[PDB]
């Protein structure tokens, strides 16, 4: 976890977890709230906040479709995950701008 | 607008006729070429099989003769 | 993925429902999948009336009668008598 | 004709005085111990009786004679002659009953692999694979034979034969829905064919088939895969195949059967399709 | 002009069809040549092996003498 | 009429192309094979020349 | 797999057997003086061990055994067999160690050319150049090998092979080496096909390449050579390449990079590039000032 471990990408099991924007991991592997860095290559790391789910098989992390098309992920692809710790004194979001549009035309 | 129509149409006829003639001479030439290696490789067929028969029979007769001498 | 605009006869569905679900417990708000003309539909029990006293949980029997009403803002075109629309004017 | 059936009768008689030759082996070679050449001429008459049978269209008898001649001749000597006789018996058995042809061909394969002659062994492996396919239904044994023959061919840099064998294997595996091996093989062969100026025109078809196979498993990564194909080969998008695949994948985003139905009908309107592509599309586009 | 284009289309049709025939003949002849080269490969390899073992055996026999 | 004629033209041209590509592949296979057969032929020629000459010399 | 492990086990056993066999042969030569059959049978054991070892899928020791057997065989005044074993060992090492493969292949080349066979020597030279350039990054030695192969081919009037080798050499030189040799080779090969049986309409491209090379040198040489070819080869007058070149020349004359860019874009739109013309055109555009 701290150093990072190899994981198999899986599909999100529930719609709610898909809407939660959090990576779904097994309680045996992680806990909910944990921030992990997903490494697909030396130059591609993506930060996700974890949410454990009983349906998630250990050794795999579930991601929703928008997460998959953002991180360029494939279900069943190998990823390396290491727990990440924020510098709350510096990494707490004061103001952030969001571009929003209707999801379905 | 008929000017560019006539221009492109002359260009089309010229290129198509020329290109067809090139394809045609190419193909006819090559087809005429093929037969030659056809019969050449036929004749190596025959020469080789003659070699094979002759050497096989020679060697078997020579082994028999060597057995006779020994 | 299987949505279509073809009409679905409610009366035949009602008979199929009675044929499929006769002698089975049903409760208001229950959700189920129904196979009708090789088409899968999602059904929600909205109201149940005893054989006119109102009941919360009932038993479907062969003589039980079915009245259909399409879901709010649904495009389903219900025909037949086993029914009971949207206002052309904005609410 | 008929008189040649009578002479095949006296050719069973020829095998019969070959049986008298093995009776010599039983009792008379005690005084004819030096008659190893007598055994050789017995094998020769065996082979020629087998040839008369073959001409007489008696495939079972010809194969029996070939196998017996091979067994008698393979007296730990003249092994290559025994291998030739075994392959001849296998060819004779090809028609009618081919099962024992498999065993004789395997024995010849072992003899050749013992000798090291890998082109002959691998072509015989292709032969047994194709007779399995055309006569029997087992495909896994054909797949293993094809893999083995392709390995032997690639051992001696015979790249094209291995490439075609792997193409057939990938096609069969795709029919057997094991898409990882198929995509691996198709990508390999396409990226190899594009290397040299003699085959660069073929790459499009291999890339299209690999794209279809990848698209079968994961919709989402299909777009990334096709983008990778495009950027790797700038001259791929122009091809009608890439445009059609893009149309199909973008149409799949919206649940409209028509879109892809008329797409495929229009594409077929310019050329006919094969069983593999039509079946694959029918299976995949169902969902 | 248009009449010349009709002549051109007629000529092109003729040429395309006869090109098709030629190509088919090419393919037939080429596949025949491939088959028979294959048979020659087989026979040549067999001759190679037989004659190599022949020379080996003959030299061993001479050594015995 | 010209439209259908050009449809025919397209179909014939693409068909000829598709078949010719395989024609070329076959010819490449032929060329690939011939060098191996040539090497084997030269090897047997050398072996036969040396063997027969050595045997003839030994005969003396 | 059982097949592998068994193949390596028996190969080690056979190698030990061959080593003890050769030592006992050294002993017996003085002890009994049986001639040379012992060494020959030891070489046969070595060859069988090496072939089943390369069959075990392991290569380096297979080629090493081939080299040892060939060395011991050549020790007995047998050359062609040892050279064939050298070639096989080099082929085996091709995937194991380039240096030893190159050494053995050069040995085979020298010994063959000593025998009197050129075409085999030229083929080995081409293979050496291919392996040298494909994985090892260098050209000059490859250029030398290709030139030697072409020379040997021309020595036996093998016009096609020498033509291809010289064309490749000229292309590589134009890429990196100076241009005069490219000019000469390209022009000679192109003009040596005016009467080709099948290639009557081929030399054109070559001339264009030459023209480009000439244009890479200077504008005046470009135009003068262009004219010379115009008179020499009438058909080039009506080639699309001639018009493209003339348009590029007149555009670069006035120093309007936009005209050159649009011309090259239009050519690319009509016809796909080759990845060799684009580099030269970029280099030409680099010097517009």
In three-state form (DSSP H/G/I as H, E/B as E, the rest C), the secondary structure along G214-279 is HHHHCHHHHHHHHHHHHHHCHHHHHCHHHHHHHHHHHHHHHCCHHHHHHHHHHHHHHCCCCCCHHH
Cα→Cα distances D70→D53, G130, G176, Å: 16, 46, 63
Q: Which residues contact D106 (CB under 8 A, 6 or more apart)?
A: D128
Distance in angstroms (rounded) separating the CA atoms of residues G95 and G263: 47
Burial class (CB in 10 A: 0-12, 13-18, 19+), D229: buried
Residues 3-42 of C with CB under 8 A from D: 3
Q: For residue C79, what is the enclosing H or E element?
A: strand C78-79
Q: Among residues D39, D42, D37, D35, which one has the least CA distance to residue D17?
A: D42
Q: What share of chain E is helix, strand, coil (3-state, %, to 5)?
A: 95, 0, 5
DSSP G16: H
Burial class (CB in 10 A: 0-12, 13-18, 19+), D49: buried
Q: Which residues in chain D have their CB less than 8 angstroms from residue C3's CB? A: 255
Q: Are β-strands A5-11 and A60-63 bridged in parallel, bridged antiparallel, or unpaired?
A: parallel
Whether F20 contacts chain E with CB within 8 A: yes
- Give the minimum alpha-carbon distance from D158 to chain F in angstroms, rounded to a whole number: 9
Which residue of chain G has the CA closest to D154?
G57
Tell me the DSSP string of G62-98: HHHHHHHHHHHHHTTT--HHHHHHHHHHHHHHTTT-H
User: What 3-state class would DSSP assign to G111?
Assistant: helix
- Alpha carbon distance, N-terminus to C-terminus of chain D: 63
A-D contacts (CB, under 8 Å) = 11
Sign of the alpha-carbon dihedral angle for G60, G63, G69, G70: negative
Q: Are β-strands A5-11 and A23-25 bridged in parallel, bridged antiparallel, or unpaired?
A: unpaired
- Give the minimum alpha-carbon distance from G274 to chain D in angstroms, rounded to a whole number: 11
Which residue of chain G has the CA closest to D197?
G274
Q: Are β-strands A60-63 and C8-9 bridged in parallel, bridged antiparallel, or unpaired?
A: unpaired
Whether G217 contacts chain F with CB within 8 A: no
Distance in angstroms (rounded) separating the CA atoms of residues G103 and G94: 11
- Give the minimum alpha-carbon distance from E47 to chain F in angstroms, rounded to a whole number: 9
Sign of the alpha-carbon dihedral angle for D200, D203, D204, D205: positive
Distance in angstroms (rounded) separating the CA atoms of residues G216 and G238: 23
Which residue of chain G has the CA closest to B24?
G198
Whether B62 contacts chain E with CB within 8 A: yes
- Residue D74 phi, psi (nearest 5): -80, 55
DSSP A52: E
Sign of the alpha-carbon dihedral angle for G137, G141, G144, G149: negative
Q: Angle, to 10 degrees, between the axis of helix D179-193 and the axis of helix D203-217?
A: 160
Beta bridge partners of C24: C60
Q: How was this structure determined?
A: cryo-EM
Cα→Cα distances C54→A88, C28, C57, C71, Å: 59, 11, 9, 22
Which residue of chain F has the CA closest to D271?
F11
Q: Do chains D and F touch (3 or more CB pairs under 8 A)?
A: yes
Distance in angstroms (rounded) separating the CA atoms of residues G171 and D123: 40
Tell me whether residues E22 and B20 touch, CB distance under 8 A.
no
Distance in angstroms (rounded) separating the CA atoms of residues G237 and G226: 10
Resolution (A): 4.5
Distance in angstroms (rounded) separating the CA atoms of residues B20 and B18: 5
Please provide the size of chain A in residues.
105
Q: Angle, to 10 degrees, between the axis of helix E2-64 and the axis of helix B2-69?
A: 20
Tell me whether residues D199 and F25 touch, CB distance under 8 A.
yes
Nearest to D120 among E45, E50, E53 (CB): E45
Would you say D72 and D55 are in contact if contact means Cβ atoms under 8 Å apart?
A: no
Distance in angstroms (rounded) separating the CA atoms of residues E65 and G204: 69
Would you say G3 and G48 are in contact if contact means Cβ atoms under 8 Å apart?
A: no
Distance in angstroms (rounded) separating the CA atoms of residues G211 and G204: 11
Would you say B61 and B53 are in contact if contact means Cβ atoms under 8 Å apart?
A: no
User: What 3-state class would DSSP assign to C78?
Assistant: strand
Q: Which residues in chain D have their CB less than 8 angstroms from residue A65's CB? A: 220
Q: Which residues in chain F have their CB less than 8 angstroms from residue D199's CB? A: 25, 28
Tell me whether residues F40 and E13 touch, CB distance under 8 A.
no
- Give the minimum alpha-carbon distance from E5 to chain F in angstroms, rounded to a whole number: 10
Distance in angstroms (rounded) separating the CA atoms of residues C59 and D233: 66
Q: Among residues D250, D234, D242, which one has the least CA distance to residue D267?
A: D242
Q: Are β-strands A78-84 and A35-41 bridged in parallel, bridged antiparallel, or unpaired?
A: antiparallel
Distance in angstroms (rounded) separating the CA atoms of residues D173 and D104: 28
Q: Do chains A and D touch (3 or more CB pairs under 8 A)?
A: yes
Whether A69 contacts chain D with CB within 8 A: yes
Would you say A44 and A59 are in contact if contact means Cβ atoms under 8 Å apart?
A: no
Neighbours of chain F (3+ CB pairs under 8 A): D, E, G
DSSP C49: B
Q: Are β-strands C78-79 and C8-9 bridged in parallel, bridged antiparallel, or unpaired?
A: parallel
- Give the minimum alpha-carbon distance from D189 to chain A in angstroms, rounded to a whole number: 23
- Give the minimum alpha-carbon distance from D285 to chain C in angstroms, rounded to a whole number: 12
Nearest to B9 among E5, E37, E50 (CB): E5
User: What 3-state class would DSSP assign to A82?
Assistant: strand
- Give the minimum alpha-carbon distance from E63 to chain B in angstroms, rounded to a whole number: 13
- Which of B2, B39, B59, B67 should we substitute to test contact with E (largest number of E Cβ atoms within 10 Å)? B59
Tell me whether residues G120 and F42 touch, CB distance under 8 A.
yes
- Residue G255 phi, psi (nearest 5): 60, 60
**Residue recorded with tokens 């020579």:** B62
Q: Which long-range contacts (CB under 8 A, 24 or more apart) does A33-36 make?
A: A34/A83, A35/A83, A35/A84, A35/A85, A35/A86, A36/A61, A36/A81, A36/A82, A36/A83, A36/A84
Beta bridge partners of C25: C59
- Give the minimum alpha-carbon distance from G89 to chain F in angstroms, rounded to a whole number: 16
Nearest to G80 among F35, F39, F50 (CB): F50
- Based on DSSP, count helices (H) and strands (E) in chain C, helices before strands: 1, 6
Tell me whether residues D80 and E49 touch, CB distance under 8 A.
yes
Would you say D223 and D190 are in contact if contact means Cβ atoms under 8 Å apart?
A: no
- For residue D259, the tally of other CB atoms under 10 A from its CB is 16
Distance in angstroms (rounded) separating the CA atoms of residues D207 and D70: 49
Which residue of chain E has the CA closest to B44?
E40
Q: Which residues contact A29 (CB under 8 A, 6 or more apart)?
A: A1, A7, A52, A56, A58, A59, A61
Tell me the DSSP string of D100-135: HHHHHHHHHHHHHHHHT-HHHHHHHHHHHHHHHHHH
Neighbouring C-alpha atoms within 13 Å toward the C-beta of F1: 5
Whether B22 contacts chain G with CB within 8 A: yes
C61: left (phi over 0), alpha (psi -120 to 50) or beta: beta
Q: Which residues contact D107 (CB under 8 A, 6 or more apart)?
A: D86
Whether G201 contacts chain B with CB within 8 A: yes
**Residue recorded with tokens 């016809």:** G271
Distance in angstroms (rounded) separating the CA atoms of residues E9 and E5: 6
Q: For residue C44, what is the enclosing H or E element?
A: strand C39-44
Nearest to F29 among D160, D202, D271 (CB): D160
**Residue recorded with tokens 């100026």:** D197
Tell me the DSSP string of chain D: -HHHHHHHHHHHHHHHHHHHHHHHHHTGGGT-TTTHHHHHHHHHHHHHHHHHHHHTT-HHHHHHHHHHHHHHH-SSS-HHHHHHHHHHHHHHHHSS--HHHHHHHHHHHHHHHHHT-HHHHHHHHHHHHHHHHHHS---HHHHHHHHHHHHHHHHTT-HHHHHHHHHHHHHHHHHTT-HHHHHHHHHHHHHHHTTSTTTTTTHHHHHHHHHHHHHHH-HHHHHHHHHHHHHH-TTSSSSHHHHHHHHHHHHHTS--HHHHHHHHHHHHHHS---HHHHHHHHHHHT-
Instruction: Enter the tokens of residue D233.
Output: 């080969």
Q: Angle, to 10 degrees, between the axis of helix G60-74 and the axis of helix G80-93?
A: 170
Burial letters G242-263, b for 16+ CB under 10 A, else e = bebbebbbebbeeeeeebbeeb
Q: Among residues E49, D78, F45, D51, which one has the least CA distance to residue B63?
A: D78
Which residue of chain A has the CA closest to D222?
A74
Nearest to B52 among E23, E47, E57 (CB): E47
Whether F10 contacts chain D with CB within 8 A: yes
Tell me whether residues G55 and D235 touch, CB distance under 8 A.
no
Nearest to F5 among E9, E34, E55 (CB): E9
Neighbours of chain A (3+ CB pairs under 8 A): D
Whether E26 contacts chain B with CB within 8 A: yes
- For residue D258, the tally of other CB atoms under 10 A from its CB is 8
């Amino acid at each position: 976890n701290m150093a990072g471990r190899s994981m198999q990408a899986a599909r999100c099991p529930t719609d709610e977890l898909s809407l939660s924007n959090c990576a779904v991991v097994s309680e045996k592997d992680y806990q909910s709230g944990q921030h992990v860095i997903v490494r697909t290559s030396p130059n591609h790391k993506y930060i996700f906040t974890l949410r454990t789910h009983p349906s998630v098989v250990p050794g795999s992390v579930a991601f929703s479709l928008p997460q998959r098309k953002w991180a360029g992920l494939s279900i069943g692809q190998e990823i390396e995950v290491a727990l990440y710790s924020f510098d709350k004194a510096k990494q707490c979001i004061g103001t952030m701008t969001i571009e929003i549009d209707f999801l379905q035309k | 607008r008929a000017d560019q129509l006539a221009d492109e149409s002359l260009e089309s006829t010229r290129r198509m006729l020329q290109l067809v003639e090139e394809s045609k001479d190419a193909g006819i030439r090559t087809l005429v070429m093929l037969d030659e290696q056809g019969e050449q490789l036929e004749r190596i067929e025959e020469g080789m099989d003659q070699i094979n028969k002759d050497m096989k029979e020679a060697e078997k007769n020579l082994t028999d003769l060597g057995k006779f001498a020994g | 993925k299987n949505i279509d605009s073809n009409p679905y006869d409610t009366d035949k569905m009602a008979a199929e429902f009675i044929q499929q679900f006769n002698n089975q417990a049903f409760s208001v708000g229950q959700q189920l999948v129904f196979s009708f003309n090789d088409k899968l539909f999602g059904l929600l029990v909205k109201d149940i009336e005893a054989m006119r006293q109102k009941i919360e949980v009932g038993l479907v029997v062969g003589n039980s009668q079915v009245a259909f009403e399409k879901a709010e803002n649904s495009s389903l075109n219900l025909i037949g008598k086993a029914k009971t629309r949207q206002s052309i004017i904005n609410p | 004709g008929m008189d040649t059936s009578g002479k095949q009768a006296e050719a069973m008689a020829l095998l019969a005085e070959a049986e008298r030759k093995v009776k010599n082996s039983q009792s008379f070679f005690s005084g004819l111990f030096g008659g190893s050449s007598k055994i050789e001429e017995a094998c020769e008459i065996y082979a020629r009786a087998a040839n008369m049978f073959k001409m007489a269209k008696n495939w079972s008898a010809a194969g029996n004679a070939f196998c017996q001649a091979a067994q008698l001749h393979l007296q730990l000597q003249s092994k290559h002659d025994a291998a030739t006789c075994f392959v001849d018996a296998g060819n004779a058995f090809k028609k009618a009953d081919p099962q024992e042809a498999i065993n004789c061909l395997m024995r010849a394969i072992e003899i050749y692999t013992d000798m090291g002659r890998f082109t002959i062994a691998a072509k015989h492996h292709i032969s047994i694979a194709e007779i399995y396919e055309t006569e029997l239904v087992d495909v896994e044994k054909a797949i293993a034979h094809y893999e083995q023959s392709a390995d032997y061919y690639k051992g001696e840099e015979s790249n094209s034969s291995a490439n075609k064998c792997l193409l057939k294997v990938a096609g069969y595996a795709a029919q057997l829905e094991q898409y990882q091996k198929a995509i691996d093989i198709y990508e390999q062969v396409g990226t190899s064919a594009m290397d040299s100026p003699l085959l660069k025109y073929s790459a499009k078809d291999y890339f299209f088939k690999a794209a279809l196979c990848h698209f079968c498993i994961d919709m989402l990564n299909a777009k990334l895969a096709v983008q990778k194909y495009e950027e790797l080969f700038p001259a791929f998008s122009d091809s009608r195949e890439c445009k059609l695949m893009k149309k199909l994948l973008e149409a799949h985003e919206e649940q409209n059967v028509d879109s892809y139905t008329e797409s495929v009908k229009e594409y077929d309107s310019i050329s006919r399709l094969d069983q593999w592509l039509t079946t694959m599309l029918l299976r995949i586009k169902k969902t | 002009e248009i009449e010349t284009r009709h002549s051109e289309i007629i000529k092109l049709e003729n040429s395309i069809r006869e090109l098709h025939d030629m190509f088919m003949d090419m393919a037939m002849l080429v596949e025949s040549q491939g088959e028979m080269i294959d048979r020659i490969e087989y026979n040549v390899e067999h001759a190679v092996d037989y004659v190599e073992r022949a020379v080996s055996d003959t030299k061993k026999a001479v050594k015995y003498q």
